[PDB]
Coordinates of C-alpha atoms in Angstrom, one line a residue:
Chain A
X8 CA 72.8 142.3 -28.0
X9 CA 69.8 144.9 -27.7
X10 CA 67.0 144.4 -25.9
X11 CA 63.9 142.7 -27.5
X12 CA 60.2 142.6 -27.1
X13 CA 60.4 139.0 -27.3
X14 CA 62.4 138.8 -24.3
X15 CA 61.6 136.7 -21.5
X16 CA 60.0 139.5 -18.8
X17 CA 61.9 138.4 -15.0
X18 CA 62.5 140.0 -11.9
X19 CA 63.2 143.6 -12.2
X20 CA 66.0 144.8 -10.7
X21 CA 65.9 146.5 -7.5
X22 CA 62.1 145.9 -7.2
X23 CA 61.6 149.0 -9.5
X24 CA 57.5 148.7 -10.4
X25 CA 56.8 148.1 -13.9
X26 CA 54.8 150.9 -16.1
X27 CA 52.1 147.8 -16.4
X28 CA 51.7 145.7 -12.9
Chain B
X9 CA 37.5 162.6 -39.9
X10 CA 35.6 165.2 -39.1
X11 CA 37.5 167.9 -38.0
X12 CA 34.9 169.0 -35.4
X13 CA 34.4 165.3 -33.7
X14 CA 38.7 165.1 -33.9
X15 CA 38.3 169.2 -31.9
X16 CA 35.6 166.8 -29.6
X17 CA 38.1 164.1 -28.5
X18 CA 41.3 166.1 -28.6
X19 CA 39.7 168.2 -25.4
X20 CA 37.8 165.2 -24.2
X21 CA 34.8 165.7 -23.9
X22 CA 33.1 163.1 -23.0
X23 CA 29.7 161.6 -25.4
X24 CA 27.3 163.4 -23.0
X25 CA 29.1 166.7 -23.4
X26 CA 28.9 166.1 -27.0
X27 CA 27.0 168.7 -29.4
X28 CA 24.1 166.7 -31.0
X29 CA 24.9 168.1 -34.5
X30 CA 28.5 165.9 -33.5
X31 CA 27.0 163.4 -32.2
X32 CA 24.7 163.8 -35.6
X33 CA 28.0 163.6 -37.1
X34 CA 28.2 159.9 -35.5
X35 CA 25.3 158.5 -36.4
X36 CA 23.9 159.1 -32.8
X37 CA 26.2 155.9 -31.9
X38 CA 28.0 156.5 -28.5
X39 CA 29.9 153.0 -29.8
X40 CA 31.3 155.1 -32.7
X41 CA 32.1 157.7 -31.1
X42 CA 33.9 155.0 -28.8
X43 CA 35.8 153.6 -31.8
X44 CA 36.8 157.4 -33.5
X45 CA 38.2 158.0 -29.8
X46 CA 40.5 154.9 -30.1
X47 CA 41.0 155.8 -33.8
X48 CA 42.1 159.5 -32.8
X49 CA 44.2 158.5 -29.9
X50 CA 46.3 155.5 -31.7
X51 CA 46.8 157.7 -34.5
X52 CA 47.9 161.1 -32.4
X53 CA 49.9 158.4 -30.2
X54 CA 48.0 160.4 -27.2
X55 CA 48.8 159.0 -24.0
X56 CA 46.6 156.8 -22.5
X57 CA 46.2 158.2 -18.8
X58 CA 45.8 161.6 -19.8
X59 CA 43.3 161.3 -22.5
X60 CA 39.5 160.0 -23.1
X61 CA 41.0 156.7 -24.6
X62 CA 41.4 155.7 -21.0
X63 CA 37.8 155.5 -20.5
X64 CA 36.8 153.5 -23.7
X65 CA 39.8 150.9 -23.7
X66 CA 40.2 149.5 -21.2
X67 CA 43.8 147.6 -21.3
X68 CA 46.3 150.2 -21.3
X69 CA 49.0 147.7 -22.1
X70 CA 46.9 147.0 -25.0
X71 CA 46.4 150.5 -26.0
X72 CA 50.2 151.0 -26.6
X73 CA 50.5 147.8 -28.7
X74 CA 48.2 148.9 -30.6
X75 CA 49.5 152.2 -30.8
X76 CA 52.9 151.4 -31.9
X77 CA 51.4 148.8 -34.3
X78 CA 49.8 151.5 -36.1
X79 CA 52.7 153.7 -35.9
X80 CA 54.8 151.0 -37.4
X81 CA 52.3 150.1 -40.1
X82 CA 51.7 154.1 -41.5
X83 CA 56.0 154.5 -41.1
X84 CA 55.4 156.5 -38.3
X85 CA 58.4 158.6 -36.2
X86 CA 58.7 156.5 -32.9
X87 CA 56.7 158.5 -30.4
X88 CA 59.4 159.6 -28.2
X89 CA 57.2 161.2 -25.9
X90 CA 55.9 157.6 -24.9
X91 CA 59.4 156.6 -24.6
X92 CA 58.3 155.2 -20.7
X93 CA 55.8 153.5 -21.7
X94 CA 57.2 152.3 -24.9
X95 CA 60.6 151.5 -23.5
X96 CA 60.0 150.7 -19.8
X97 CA 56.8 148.9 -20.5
X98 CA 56.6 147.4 -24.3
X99 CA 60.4 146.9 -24.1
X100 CA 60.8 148.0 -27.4
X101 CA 63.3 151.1 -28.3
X102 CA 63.6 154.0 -31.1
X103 CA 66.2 151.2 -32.6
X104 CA 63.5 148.7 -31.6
X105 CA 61.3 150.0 -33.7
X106 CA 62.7 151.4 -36.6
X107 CA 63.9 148.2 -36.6
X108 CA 60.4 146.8 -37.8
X109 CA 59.9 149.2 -39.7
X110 CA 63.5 148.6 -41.7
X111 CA 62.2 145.1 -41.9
X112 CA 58.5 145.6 -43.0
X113 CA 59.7 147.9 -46.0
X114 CA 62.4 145.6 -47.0
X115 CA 60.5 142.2 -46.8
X116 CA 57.7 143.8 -48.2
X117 CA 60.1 145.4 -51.8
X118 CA 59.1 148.6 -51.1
X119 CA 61.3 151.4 -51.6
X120 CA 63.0 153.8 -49.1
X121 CA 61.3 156.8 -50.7
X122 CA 58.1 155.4 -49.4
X123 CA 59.7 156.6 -45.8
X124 CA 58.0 159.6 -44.7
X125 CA 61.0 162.3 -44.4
X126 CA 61.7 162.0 -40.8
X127 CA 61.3 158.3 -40.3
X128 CA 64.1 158.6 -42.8
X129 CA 65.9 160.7 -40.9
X130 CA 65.3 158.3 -37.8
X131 CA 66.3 155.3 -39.9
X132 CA 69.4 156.7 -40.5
X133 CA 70.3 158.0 -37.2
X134 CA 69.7 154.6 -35.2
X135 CA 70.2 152.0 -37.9
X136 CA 72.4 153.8 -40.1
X137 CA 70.6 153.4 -43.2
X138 CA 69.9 155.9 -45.8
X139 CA 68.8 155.4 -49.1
X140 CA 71.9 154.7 -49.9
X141 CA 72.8 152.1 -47.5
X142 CA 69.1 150.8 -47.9
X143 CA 69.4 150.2 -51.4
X144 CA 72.8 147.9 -51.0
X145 CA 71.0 146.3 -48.4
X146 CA 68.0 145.2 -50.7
X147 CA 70.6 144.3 -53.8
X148 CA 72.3 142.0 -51.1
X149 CA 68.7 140.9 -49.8
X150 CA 68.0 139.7 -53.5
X151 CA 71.2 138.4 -54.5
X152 CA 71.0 136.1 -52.0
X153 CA 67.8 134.6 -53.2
X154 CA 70.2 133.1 -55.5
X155 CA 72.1 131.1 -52.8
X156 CA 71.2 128.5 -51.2
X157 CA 71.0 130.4 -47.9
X158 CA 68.4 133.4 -48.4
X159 CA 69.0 136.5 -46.5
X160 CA 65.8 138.6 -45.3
X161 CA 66.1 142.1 -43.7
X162 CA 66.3 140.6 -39.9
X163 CA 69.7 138.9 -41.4
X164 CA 70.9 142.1 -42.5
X165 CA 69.7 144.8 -40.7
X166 CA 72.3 145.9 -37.7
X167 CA 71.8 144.4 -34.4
X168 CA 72.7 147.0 -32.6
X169 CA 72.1 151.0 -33.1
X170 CA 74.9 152.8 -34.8
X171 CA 76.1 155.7 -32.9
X172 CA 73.7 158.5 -32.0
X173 CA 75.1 161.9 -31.5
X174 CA 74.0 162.8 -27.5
X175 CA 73.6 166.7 -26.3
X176 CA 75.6 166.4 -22.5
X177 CA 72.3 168.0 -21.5
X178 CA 69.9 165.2 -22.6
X179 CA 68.6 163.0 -19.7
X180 CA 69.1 159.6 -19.2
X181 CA 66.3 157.3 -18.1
X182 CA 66.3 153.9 -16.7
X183 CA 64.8 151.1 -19.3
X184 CA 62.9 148.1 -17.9
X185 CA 66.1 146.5 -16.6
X186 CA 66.1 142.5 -15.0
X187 CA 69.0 140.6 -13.1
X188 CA 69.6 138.7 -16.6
X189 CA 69.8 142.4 -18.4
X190 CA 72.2 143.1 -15.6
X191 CA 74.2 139.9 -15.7
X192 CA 75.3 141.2 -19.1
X193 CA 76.3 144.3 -17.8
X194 CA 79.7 146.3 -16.9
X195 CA 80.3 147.4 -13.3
X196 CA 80.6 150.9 -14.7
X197 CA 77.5 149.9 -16.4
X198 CA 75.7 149.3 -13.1
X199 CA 77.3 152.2 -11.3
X200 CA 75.3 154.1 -13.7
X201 CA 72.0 152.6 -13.3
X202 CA 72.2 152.4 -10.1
X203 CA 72.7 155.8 -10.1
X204 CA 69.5 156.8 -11.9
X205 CA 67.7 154.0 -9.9
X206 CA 68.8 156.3 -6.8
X207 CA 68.9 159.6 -7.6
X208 CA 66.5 159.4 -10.6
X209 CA 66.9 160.7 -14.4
X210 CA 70.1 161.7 -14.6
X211 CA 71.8 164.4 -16.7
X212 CA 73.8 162.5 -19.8
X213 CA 76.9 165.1 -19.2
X214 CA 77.3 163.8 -15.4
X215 CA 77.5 160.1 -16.6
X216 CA 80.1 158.4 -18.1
X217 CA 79.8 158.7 -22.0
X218 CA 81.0 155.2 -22.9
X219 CA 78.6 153.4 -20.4
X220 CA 75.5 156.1 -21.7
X221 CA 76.2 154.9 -24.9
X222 CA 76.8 151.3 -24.3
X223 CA 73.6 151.2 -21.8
X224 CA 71.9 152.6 -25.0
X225 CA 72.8 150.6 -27.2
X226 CA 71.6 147.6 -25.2
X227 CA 68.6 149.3 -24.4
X228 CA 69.0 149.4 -21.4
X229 CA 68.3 153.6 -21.1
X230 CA 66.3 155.6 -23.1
X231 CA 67.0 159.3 -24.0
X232 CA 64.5 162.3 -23.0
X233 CA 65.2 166.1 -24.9
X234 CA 63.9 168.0 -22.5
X235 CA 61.9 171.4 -23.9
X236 CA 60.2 173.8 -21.8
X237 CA 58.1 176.6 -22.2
X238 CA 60.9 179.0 -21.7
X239 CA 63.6 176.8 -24.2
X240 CA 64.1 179.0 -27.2
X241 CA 65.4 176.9 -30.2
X242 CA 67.1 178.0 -33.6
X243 CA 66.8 175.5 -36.9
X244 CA 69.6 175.4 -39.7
X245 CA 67.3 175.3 -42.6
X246 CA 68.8 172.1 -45.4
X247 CA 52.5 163.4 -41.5
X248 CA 52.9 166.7 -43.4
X249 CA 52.2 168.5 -40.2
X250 CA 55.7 168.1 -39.2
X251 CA 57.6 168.7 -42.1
X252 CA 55.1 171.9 -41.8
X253 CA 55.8 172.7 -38.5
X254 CA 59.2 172.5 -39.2
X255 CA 59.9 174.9 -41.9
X256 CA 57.5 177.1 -40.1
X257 CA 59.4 177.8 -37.4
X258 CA 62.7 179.5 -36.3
X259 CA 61.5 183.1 -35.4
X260 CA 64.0 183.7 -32.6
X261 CA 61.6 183.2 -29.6
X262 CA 60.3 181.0 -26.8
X263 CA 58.9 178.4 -27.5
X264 CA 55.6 178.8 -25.6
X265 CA 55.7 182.0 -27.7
X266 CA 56.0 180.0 -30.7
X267 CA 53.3 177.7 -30.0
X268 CA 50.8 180.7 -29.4
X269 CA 52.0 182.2 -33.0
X270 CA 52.0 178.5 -35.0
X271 CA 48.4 178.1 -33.3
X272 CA 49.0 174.4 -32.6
X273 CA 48.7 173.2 -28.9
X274 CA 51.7 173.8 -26.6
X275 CA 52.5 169.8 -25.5
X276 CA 52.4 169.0 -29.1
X277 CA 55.1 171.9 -30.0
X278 CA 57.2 170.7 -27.2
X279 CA 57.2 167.5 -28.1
X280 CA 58.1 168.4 -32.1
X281 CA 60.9 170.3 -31.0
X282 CA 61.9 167.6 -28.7
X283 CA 62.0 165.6 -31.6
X284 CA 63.6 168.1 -34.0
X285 CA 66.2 168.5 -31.6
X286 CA 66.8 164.6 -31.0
X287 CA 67.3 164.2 -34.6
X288 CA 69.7 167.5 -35.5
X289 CA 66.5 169.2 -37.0
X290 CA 67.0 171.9 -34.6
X291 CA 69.0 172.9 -32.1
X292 CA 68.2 173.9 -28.5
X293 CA 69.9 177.4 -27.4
X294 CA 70.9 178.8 -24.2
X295 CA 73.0 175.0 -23.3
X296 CA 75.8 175.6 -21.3
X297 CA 78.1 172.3 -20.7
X298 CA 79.6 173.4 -16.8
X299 CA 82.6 171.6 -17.1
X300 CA 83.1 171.6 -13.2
X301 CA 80.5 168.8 -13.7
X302 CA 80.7 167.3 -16.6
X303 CA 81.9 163.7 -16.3
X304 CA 85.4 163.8 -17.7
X305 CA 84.7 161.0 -20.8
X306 CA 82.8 163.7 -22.4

């Protein structure tokens, strides 16, 4: 599968910080 | 728009730096001006931080929703330059997104010549639809109105985007990834971005080629064309501003140099070529594959 915008946002791997908090 | 308020908030000034014969222009509203700003940006898909926008909106999140709805609506390219933000932090990819627009022209009965020329071009390269394909896709879309089970463009658009032709000397860039994302992943898979989690953006040649394209095709990495001021470029010649840039260009030079001659501001050159490139428009001279370290799949 691709990745979707109407996926479920969880951890992110290897504590990366997100581009929005 | 005027073009002299759209020359005010390209080089952001500010309403208090505004002449008053443009600010006569905006009815002496600070609010409009305001609104043209957010107008200007969604529709130049400027990037938030580095741009007025940032001081009228004030979710940036919500700035690049926006943006890409509008892009989507008006069958925009994707903006590839905002492929962080749009990747990384909308989730939503080139495939992503031509995606919806695949699906908003079908659903909607319009035809594929309504596709500006290289949204087209996109649509073909990530979905693998042309006309061609496009128009077997609608005959099956209304054929099946005839069964009991209807078919709309989600059921028949791919799932997954076709293969993309990669230069060894584009970079690779980590997505938004989770521990789910990763659960689905190969160890090969991980090696990878854990690789560019380490060491950062990583050339595609020093990866292997079946995990870049497999991470891509989950989405999972997003592809940056690098062009510099330096990078000369050469075209093979078979909104408008584009397609005019385009068959403008060639002129065996820099293409700094070539942004001085067309006139148009330098980020916006690089990023057309970037683009031109990405999609076999043009093609980026002086690349040299060092086979000492290029990753032996490719």
């Amino acid at each position: 599968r691709h990745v979707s915008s109407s996926d479920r946002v969880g951890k992110p791997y290897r504590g990366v910080k997100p581009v929005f908090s | 728009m005027n073009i002299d308020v759209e020359f005010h908030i390209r080089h952001n000034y500010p309403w208090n730096k505004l002449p008053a014969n443009v600010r006569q222009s905006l009815g002496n509203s600070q609010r409009e001006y305001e609104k043209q700003v957010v107008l200007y940006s969604i529709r130049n898909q400027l990037r938030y931080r580095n741009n007025l926008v940032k001081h009228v909106k004030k979710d940036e999140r919500r700035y690049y929703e926006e943006l890409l709805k509008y892009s989507r609506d008006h069958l925009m390219l994707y903006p590839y330059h905002l492929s962080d933000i749009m990747v990384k932090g909308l989730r939503i990819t080139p495939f992503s997104y031509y995606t919806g627009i695949m699906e908003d022209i079908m659903n909607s009965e319009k035809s594929y010549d309504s596709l500006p020329n290289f949204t087209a071009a996109d649509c073909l390269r990530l979905l693998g639809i042309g006309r061609n394909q496009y128009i077997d896709l609608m005959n099956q879309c209304r054929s099946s109105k005839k069964f009991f089970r209807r078919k709309t463009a989600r059921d028949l658009l791919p799932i997954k985007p076709v293969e993309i032709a990669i230069e060894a000397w584009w970079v690779v860039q980590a997505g938004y990834i989770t521990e789910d994302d990763i659960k689905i992943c190969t160890l090969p898979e991980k090696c990878a971005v854990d690789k560019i989690i380490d060491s950062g953006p990583q050339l595609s040649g020093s990866l292997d080629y079946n995990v870049v394209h497999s991470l891509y095709n989950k989405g999972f990495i997003y592809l940056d064309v690098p062009i510099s001021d330096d990078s000369c470029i050469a075209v093979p010649p078979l909104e408008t501003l584009l397609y005019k840039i385009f068959v403008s260009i060639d002129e065996h030079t820099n293409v700094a140099e070539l942004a001085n001659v067309l006139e148009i501001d330098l980020s916006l050159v690089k990023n057309a070529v970037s683009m031109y490139c990405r999609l076999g428009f043009a093609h980026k001279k002086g690349q040299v594959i060092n086979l000492d370290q290029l990753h032996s799949s490719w």
